[PDB]
């Protein structure tokens, strides 16, 4: 997207979101990142929404194909599952490449740095969901390490109701439950996060209260499923 203006790529990403053209949206936002400037809060959300929708569709398809493959156990189901898996891995590698070149290293404020480290944990987590080889353990540790650095910053620099801090804790708790086989750690993290946010709600405006309580309900929904 080298010939298109940064502002035009951002505008087109917003149009692509409206049109539910998430592959286009991700391509526009990749082009915007590659301009080399840091991203504002809104632009970070556009980048995250685009890739989360692209990889979300790939993960759903991979799960359908993996289920058919497991029930069947010709080569066609495995071949097609492998094709989808390779495409999914390619998108995760693309996102991780953008974070490494050079979003994370230029992110100095807590809000941006936590945001990008949470993304890094998420995309390693999606790689871990399909991993089966010699590097599976290292993929899981890469997710854990990114989430943990984000957690350490968020606990020092953000209030317990901050929506990024809450969403990071939610996704790290899912990592513990679904990837790391640590359901007790998942439950403890979700409970402590919820309780500390509850005790801080009194400080918030009506609008911030709505933002924080929405994510708290997601933590509670998982705790209801897990306990």
């Amino acid at each position: 997207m080298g010939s298109m203006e940064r502002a035009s790529l951002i505008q087109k990403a917003k149009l692509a979101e409206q049109a539910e053209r998430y592959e286009d949206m991700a391509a526009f936002m990749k082009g915007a990142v590659e301009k080399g400037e840091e991203l504002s809060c809104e632009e970070r959300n556009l980048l995250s929404v685009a890739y989360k929708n692209v990889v979300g569709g790939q993960r759903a398809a991979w799960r359908v194909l993996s289920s058919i493959e497991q029930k069947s156990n010709g080569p066609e189901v495995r071949e097609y599952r492998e094709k989808v898996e390779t495409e999914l891995q390619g998108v995760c590698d693309t996102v991780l490449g953008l974070l490494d070149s050079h979003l994370i290293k230029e992110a100095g404020d807590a809000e941006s740095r936590v945001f990008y480290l949470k993304m890094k944990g998420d995309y390693y987590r999606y790689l871990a969901e399909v991993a089966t080889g010699d590097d599976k353990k290292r993929i899981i540790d890469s997710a854990r390490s990114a989430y943990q650095e984000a957690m350490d910053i968020s606990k020092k620099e953000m209030p317990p109701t901050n929506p990024i801090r809450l969403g990071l804790a939610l996704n790290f708790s899912v990592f513990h439950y679904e990837i790391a086989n640590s359901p007790e750690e998942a439950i403890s993290l979700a409970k402590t996060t919820f309780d500390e946010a509850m005790a801080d709600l009194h400080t918030l405006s009506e609008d911030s209260y709505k933002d924080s309580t929405l994510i708290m309900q997601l933590l509670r929904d998982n705790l209801t499923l897990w306990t």
């Binding site: 989360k52 929708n53 998420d122 969403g167 939610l170 996704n171 899912v174 997601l218 929904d221 998982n222």
Partner: peptide, 7 residues
């Protein structure tokens, strides 16, 4: 188990 949505 649900992770964060985009919007």
């Amino acid at each position: 188990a649900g992770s964060i949505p985009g919007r």
